Amino acid sequence: NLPLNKPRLEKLINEILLKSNLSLYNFLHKYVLTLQLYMVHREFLKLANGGKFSKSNLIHNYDSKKSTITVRYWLNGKMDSKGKITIGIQRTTESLILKWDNQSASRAKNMPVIYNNIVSNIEGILDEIMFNHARIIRSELLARDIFQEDEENSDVLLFQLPTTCVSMAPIQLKIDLLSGQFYFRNPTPLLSNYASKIN
Amino acid sequence: YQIKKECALLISYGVSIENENKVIIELPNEKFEIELLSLDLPKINDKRANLMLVMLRLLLVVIFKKTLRSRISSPHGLINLNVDDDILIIRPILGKVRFANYKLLLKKIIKDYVLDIVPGSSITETEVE
Amino acid sequence: MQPPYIQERLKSLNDIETQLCSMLQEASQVTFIFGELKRGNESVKPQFENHVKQFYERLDKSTTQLRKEIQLLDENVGTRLLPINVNKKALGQDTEKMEEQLDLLSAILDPSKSK
Amino acid sequence: NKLSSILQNEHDYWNKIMQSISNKDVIFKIRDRTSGQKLLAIKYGYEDS
Amino acid sequence: MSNQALYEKLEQTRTILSVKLAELINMTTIADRNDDDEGSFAQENSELAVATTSVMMVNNQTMQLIKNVQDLLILTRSIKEKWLLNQIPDEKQIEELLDNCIETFVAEK
Amino acid sequence: MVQQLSLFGSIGDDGYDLLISTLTTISGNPPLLYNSLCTVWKPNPSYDVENVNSRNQLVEPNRIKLSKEVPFSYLIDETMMDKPLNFRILKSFTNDKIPLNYAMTRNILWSLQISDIPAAGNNRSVSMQTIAETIILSSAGKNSSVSSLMNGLGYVFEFQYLTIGVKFFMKHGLILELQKIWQIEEAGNSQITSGGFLLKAYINVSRGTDIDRINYTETALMNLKKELQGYIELSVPDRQSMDSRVAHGNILI
Numbered sequence: 001n002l003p004l005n006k007p008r009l010e011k012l013i014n015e016i017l018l019k020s021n022l023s024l025y026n027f028l029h030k031y032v033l034t035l036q037l038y039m040v041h042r043e044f045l046k047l048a049n050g051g052k053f054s055k056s057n058l059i060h061n062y063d064s065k066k067s068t069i070t071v072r073y074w075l076n077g078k079m080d081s082k083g084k085i086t087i088g089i090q091r092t093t094e095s096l097i098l099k100w101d102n103q104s105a106s107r108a109k110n111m112p113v114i115y116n117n118i119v120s121n122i123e124g125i126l127d128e129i130m131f132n133h134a135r136i137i138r139s140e141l142l143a144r145d146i147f148q149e150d151e152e153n154s155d156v157l158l159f160q161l162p163t164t165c166v167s168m169a170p171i172q173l174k175i176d177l178l179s180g181q182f183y184f185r186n187p188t189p190l191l192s193n194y195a196s197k198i199n
Numbered sequence: 200y201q202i203k204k205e206c207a208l209l210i211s212y213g214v215s216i217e218n219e220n221k222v223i224i225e226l227p228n229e230k231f232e233i234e235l236l237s238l239d240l241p242k243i244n245d246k247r248a249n250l251m252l253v254m255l256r257l258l259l260v261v262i263f264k265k266t267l268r269s270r271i272s273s274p275h276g277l278i279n280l281n282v283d284d285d286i287l288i289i290r291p292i293l294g295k296v297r298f299a300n301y302k303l304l305l306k307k308i309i310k311d312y313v314l315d316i317v318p319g320s321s322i323t324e325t326e327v328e
Numbered sequence: 329m330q331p332p333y334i335q336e337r338l339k340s341l342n343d344i345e346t347q348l349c350s351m352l353q354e355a356s357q358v359t360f361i362f363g364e365l366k367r368g369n370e371s372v373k374p375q376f377e378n379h380v381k382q383f384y385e386r387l388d389k390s391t392t393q394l395r396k397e398i399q400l401l402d403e404n405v406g407t408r409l410l411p412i413n414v415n416k417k418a419l420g421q422d423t424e425k426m427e428e429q430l431d432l433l434s435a436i437l438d439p440s441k442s443k
Numbered sequence: 444n445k446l447s448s449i450l451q452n453e454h455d456y457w458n459k460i461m462q463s464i465s466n467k468d469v470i471f472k473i474r475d476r477t478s479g480q481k482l483l484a485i486k487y488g489y490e491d492s
Numbered sequence: 493m494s495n496q497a498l499y500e501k502l503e504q505t506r507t508i509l510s511v512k513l514a515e516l517i518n519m520t521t522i523a524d525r526n527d528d529d530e531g532s533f534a535q536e537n538s539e540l541a542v543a544t545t546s547v548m549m550v551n552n553q554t555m556q557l558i559k560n561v562q563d564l565l566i567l568t569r570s571i572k573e574k575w576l577l578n579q580i581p582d583e584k585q586i587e588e589l590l591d592n593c594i595e596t597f598v599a600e601k
Numbered sequence: 602m603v604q605q606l607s608l609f610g611s612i613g614d615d616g617y618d619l620l621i622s623t624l625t626t627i628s629g630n631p632p633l634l635y636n637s638l639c640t641v642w643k644p645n646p647s648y649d650v651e652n653v654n655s656r657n658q659l660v661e662p663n664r665i666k667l668s669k670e671v672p673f674s675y676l677i678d679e680t681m682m683d684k685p686l687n688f689r690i691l692k693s694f695t696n697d698k699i700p701l702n703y704a705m706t707r708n709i710l711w712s713l714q715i716s717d718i719p720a721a722g723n724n725r726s727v728s729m730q731t732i733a734e735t736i737i738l739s740s741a742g743k744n745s746s747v748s749s750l751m752n753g754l755g756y757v758f759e760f761q762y763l764t765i766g767v768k769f770f771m772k773h774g775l776i777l778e779l780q781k782i783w784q785i786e787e788a789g790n791s792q793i794t795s796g797g798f799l800l801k802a803y804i805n806v807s808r809g810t811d812i813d814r815i816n817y818t819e820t821a822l823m824n825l826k827k828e829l830q831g832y833i834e835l836s837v838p839d840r841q842s843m844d845s846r847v848a849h850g851n852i853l854i
Contacts, residue, residue: 050219055207176210183211192211229601246436247600250593253433260426263492267419271630274770295594296601329466334575338461341572345565349450352561356447362519391505395498397571402494404579406619411581413688416625418469418491430586437592446558450565470577491629580626 033089033096037067040087040096040118044069053126057178074180076199079137085129087118100129104136127177134175147173201259202233205286214289224289226296251292258288333408340397347390354383497567504560515553522546606818607728607803608826608835612779614695614797621688623832624769624777632688632767632779636676638706639764640667640747642756643847662847665756666714667737667747675701676765688767694781695796701763703787710748710758711737718844727822728837731809761785766798773821777802782854793854802826802835 016024041062048054059072068088077083084101098115105113111132115125138157141147147157148170158170172185173195181199184191206214206222213225224231231251262285270278280286313320358379361372415423435441473484524542525534536542612620625631642665644650653660673686678700684690715733719725740750748758766780780799784791802825804818826835842853 052216185211185213187211244600247597249436250433250597253429253436254593256429257426257433260422260429263422263489264426267422267492271633271770274772274774274776295598299598299601334579337575338572341568341575342458342461345454345568348561348565348568349447349454352450353447355557356444366519387508391501394501394568398494398498401571401574406616406622409579409581411618411622413621413625413631416629416631418629421489421492430589433589433593437589437596446561472577580622 029094033094034064034067036096036119037062037069037087040122041069043119043122047123052178055179058126077180083133098125102133105132108132108136130177134177134180138175201262201286201288202255204282205288205290208282209289209293212293214293224293227300229296254292255288258291262286262288331409333404337397337400340393344390344394344397347386347393351383351386351390354379354386358383497571501564501567504564507556508560511553511556515549518546518549518553602731602733604806604809604815605728605730605732605803606806606815606822607730607801608822609728609802609838610800610833610835611794612798612800612833617692617779617798620779620833621767627828628769628771628777630770632769634673634686634688634690635768636671636673636763636765638669638671638709638761640710640761641665641759642667642751643759645752645755645757648755663715663717664759664845664847665751666716667751668712668714669709671701671709671763675705691765691767691781694765697783697790697792697795699763699783699790701785702790703785706761706785710746713737716843716845718846719840721840726837727819728840728843730843762793771825773804773817775802775804775821775825784854800833800835 013024016027041060044060048058048060051058053073056075057073059075060069062069066088068086071085071087073083073085081102081104085098086101087096087098089095090097095116096118098118100113102113105111115128118125134155138155141157142149147159150156150158150172153172155175157173157175159173160168161171162168171191173182174185175182182195184195187195202222203216206216206224215223215225217223220235222233224233265285266278266280269276309322314322358376361376361379364372365376467485469486471484471486472481474480475482521534524536525532527534621632644662650662653662676699677690681690681693713735717731719728719730737747737750740746751757761784763783763785764780765783766778769777771777778801780794780801781792782794782799784793802822804822806814806818808814829835838853842851844851
C-alpha cells in the first residue's frame with residue numbers, strides 16, 4: 001500500500017536494464033534493506049519518546065552510508081562491560097541481522113547472540129537481551145560465591161548479614177530490568193549508601 | 200504522566216509499572232492498581248478507590264497552584280519541576296498507609312513486650328504539629 | 329452568554345441585512361411593475377410612486393443605521409463594558425477545578441445524599 | 444429571485460449559527476493545516492493555568 | 493481602517509445611485525427618440541449595434557448591482573466578526589472535610 | 602553590579618484602567634501592588650576632597666541611593682481600610698497630599714546603590730546603565746542609625762521621595778513598572794508625576810562581558826516595544842538626564 005513512484009521506477013529499471021551487462025535485483029535488495037532499516041529507526045524514534053527506556057537507558061545512532069545502527073544501553077554500567085548492539089547487513093545471507101557485541105555473550109553457551117525478525121519483536125529481543133545480561137552477571141556473582149542462590153526467585157540474590165550478635169539473616173538484592181542497578185528491598189540509609197557504592 | 204514520572208523513583212519500596220497505562224503498588228496486606236483505560240454489586244472498597252481518585256486530583260491541583268505562585272513570585276526563576284521535591288502525589292497516601300501499618304506493628308510489639316509483661320503501664324497517644 | 333451590549337449590536341446588524349434583503353426584494357417588484365407600465369396599462373400607475381418612494385427610503389435609512397454601527401465600533405474602545413479583574417479565568421480554571429472536586433468529595437463523604 | 448432564495452438560505456444558516464453559539468472561553472481564528480482557510484478555535488487547555 | 497470602510501461605503505452608495513439613474517434613463521428612453529431639432533442628441537445609426545448596446549447596459553447594471561450588494565453584505569459580516577473577536581474584556585470547613593476524609597480512609601484501609 | 606537595559610514612557614491617568622486590562626491580556630499575569638522609599642545622599646561639602654585627581658580625572662564624585670520598603674499601614678488613611686489592598690487604590694492617589702509626612706520619615710532614620718551615566722554613542726537602541734549594589738542587613742553600637750552611618754562614610758542627606766505603583770512580570774525576566782512619585786519636604790508633599798503614570802520596562806544582565814545574552818535582551822525589549830505600537834510610545838530617554846554626578850545637577854523625574 002506504499003505510494004511507490006511507479007513511472008520513475010519504470011524509467012529507472014528500463015535504464016538499468018539497457019545499461020545492464022542482476023544489477024536490478026541487487027538495487028532492489030539494497031533498497032528493501034534500506035527501507036527496512038529506516039522503518040526500524042522510525043519505530044525506535046516512536047518508542048523512545050514514551051518508552052520504558054526513555055530515561056537514558058537506550059541510545060541509537062543510525063548511519064545511512066554504512067547502513068548500520070549502533071545501540072548503546074546501560075550507560076551507568078562499569079562492570080567490566082559496555083552494553084552494545086549492532087544492527088547491520090550480514091555478508092553471507094545479505095540480510096539485516098542484530099548482534100549483541102559482548103565478549104560475555106560471545107563465550108556464553110546455549111544462548112543466541114544473533115536474532116532475526118527484528119521488526120516484529122524488537123521489544124521481545126531487547127527484553128531477552130536484558131534478561132540474559134542480568135542472568136550472566138548473576139551467574140558470575142554466584143560463581144564467585146559471594147551471594148547464595150535463592151530457590152524461590154531466580155532473579156533475587158541473597159546476601160548473608162548478621163543483624164545482631166547471634167542473628168544471621170539473608171537480605172534480598174534485586175537487579176533493575178531497565179538500567180541495571182542493584183537495589184535492596186527495604187534499604188537502610190547505610191544500606192542505600194552502599195547500594196549506590198555498588199552501582 | 201505525573202504519576203508515571205513520580206513512581207519511576209519508587210521501585211526500591213515495592214512500586215512497579217506494568218505497561219504504559221498501568222501502575223502497581225504492593226503492601227504487606229494490600230494491592231493497588233492504577234490504570235488508564237479507554238471506553239472501547241457495591242464492594243467494600245469502592246468508596247476507597249473513589250476517595251483515592253479525588254485526593255489524587257486535589258494533589259494535582261495543589262501542584263498547579265504551587266507552580267503558579269512560584270511563577271508570580273519572581274521572574275528570573277526558571278520553572279523546572281524537581282521530581283524529588285515538587286511532585287508529591289503518591290508520597291502522602293503511601294506514607295499515611297505505611298505509617299498506620301508501622302503504628303499497628305509497634306502497638307503489637309509494645310503490648311507483647313511491655314503490657315503483657317509489666318502490668319499497670321499507662322499509654323497516651325499524641326500528635327505533634 | 330455574551331454581555332448585554334453585544335446582543336443588541338448583533339440584533340441591529342441582523343436588522344441591517346434584513347433591510348438590505350427587503351430593498352433587493354422591492355427592487356425586484358419595481359422592476360416587475362415597470363415592465364407592464366411600459367406595456368401600457370395605466371391601472372398600476374399609482375402603485376409606482378409608492379414603490380419608488382418606499383425603495384428609496386429603504387435604501388437611505390439602512391445605510392444611515394450602518395453609519396451609526398461603525399461609529400459605535402470606533403467609540404466603544406475600552407468603554408461601556410468597563411474592565412474587570414475579580415482572578416482572571418485562564419488562571420482561575422485552577423479554582424473552579426479546585427471547588428467542584430471538593431464538592432464531589434462532599435457528595436462522597438455523605439452517604440445519605442447519594443440517592 | 445435566485446439572489447433572494449440563496450440569500451435567505453444563508454440568513455437561515457446565519458441565524459442557526461448566531462442562536463447556536465454560547466459565550467465559552469478564549470476564541471480566535473486559525474488557518475487549518477490541511478484546508479488553509481480561517482476557522483474558529485477555542486483554547487481550553489490548562490497551559491495558562 | 494474604519495475610515496477607509498466609511499469611504500468605500502460612500503462610493504458604494506453613490507455608485508448605486510448613479511447606476512440606478514442610468515438604468516432608469518436607459519429603460520425609459522429605450523424607446524428611441526427622433527427629434528428634428530438640432531438640440532436633441534439621440535443617434536441610432538446602425539441597426540443591430542443598438543440592441544448590442546442595450547444588452548450592454550443590461551449586463552452592466554446587473555453585474556454592478558449584484559456586486560455592490562454582495563460587497564455590502566460581506567462588509568456587514570466583517571463588522572460583526574470584529575465586534576465578536578476584537579473587543580478585549582470558607583477554609584475551616586475544608587479543614588474538617590479533609591480531616592474526616594483522611595480518618596475515614598485510615599479506618600477503611 | 603548589573604547592566605540594566607531599559608526603555609521609558611509615560612501615560613495619562615485617563616487611560617490607566619484600560620492600560621491595566623491590556624497588560625493582563627498579554628502577560629497573562631495580574632498587577633501586584635508595591636511601594637518604596639528612596640533617600641539620596643551626597644558627599645559632604647565641608648570636607649575638601651583634594652584626592653580627586655584633577656590632572657587625570659581618575660574618578661568624579663557621585664550620589665548614593667538608599668532604598669527601603671514601607672508597609673501600607675503608613676500610606677492608607679482612615680477612609681480606605683474598607684477597600685481591599687489591590688491595584689484599584691491607585692485610582693484614589695491623584696492628590697498631592699499623602700498620609701506619610703516629613704516627621705514619620707525623619708523618625709525612620711535597606712539597599713545601597715550607585716550608578717553611572719549610560720554608555721555613549723548613537724548606535725544604542727536601549728538605555729544601557731551600569732549599577733553597583735549592596736545590602737545593609739542590621740547594625741549596632743551607640744549610634745546605630747542610617748544617618749549616623751552615612752555621616753561616618755562622609756555623606757549627607759540631600760532629599761527623598763516615595764514611589765507607589767504596580768509591577769508586571771513577563772517572560773525572559775522582563776519587568777514592567779507603572780509608578781507615581783511624591784517628593785517629600787517639611788514644607789509638604791508634592792506629586793511630580795502630576796496627573797499621570799510613569800512607565801518603565803527593563804531587564805537586568807548579571808555579566809557585562811556576555812554579549813549573546815545582551816543581544817537577546819535587546820531583542821526582547823525591542824519586540825515588547827513593537828508590540829505596544831499605537832497605544833504607548835516607548836522611547837530611550839536623554840543620556841544627559843540620567844547623569845547623577847555631583848558636579849552637575851539634574852534629576853529625571
